[PDB]
Amino acid sequence: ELTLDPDTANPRLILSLDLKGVRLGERAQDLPNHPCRFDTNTRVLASCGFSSGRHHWEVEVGSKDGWAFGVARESVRRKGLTPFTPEEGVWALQLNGGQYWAVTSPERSPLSCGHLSRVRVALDLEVGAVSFYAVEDMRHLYTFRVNFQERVFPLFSVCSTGTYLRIWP
């Protein structure tokens, strides 16, 4: 079962005791500045990364703005303020401005998917794709087709208070 990796987490994030949930806190924790820790962007990775095969996990999503989640290439930049874009190696859905988005670039792609509660992520490192489905009916939300060239990690980001993400098993 997937858990969030506290050594990668931006020190403003608050992880749940069971390491499944993340929200944004009001104060930066005093944590060691490991090279793998996101020091500015509000991100955390799961402790498990994948180099081959096909993998599923599910993410319970808050109803309000502030979250983005999906996958990141391991080489995603951790230090300084970085763009949240496919070019930086993040492939994600996002709730922002009251709208669900696939975070394409240079312009995001608005999704007309209706309300989301929990999303199944399907990562395929054999063919090269990451897909998102709303669990109530498995309707397709978005697929990024990517020739991944390194290990890929589940990615979570929460940039405002009042929302959350939770790995659901």
Binding site: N41, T42, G66, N96, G97, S160
Partner: peptide, 7 residues
């Protein structure tokens, strides 16, 4: 002020 710059 959504904070999305820091996503």
């Amino acid at each position: 002020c959504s904070g999305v710059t820091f996503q």
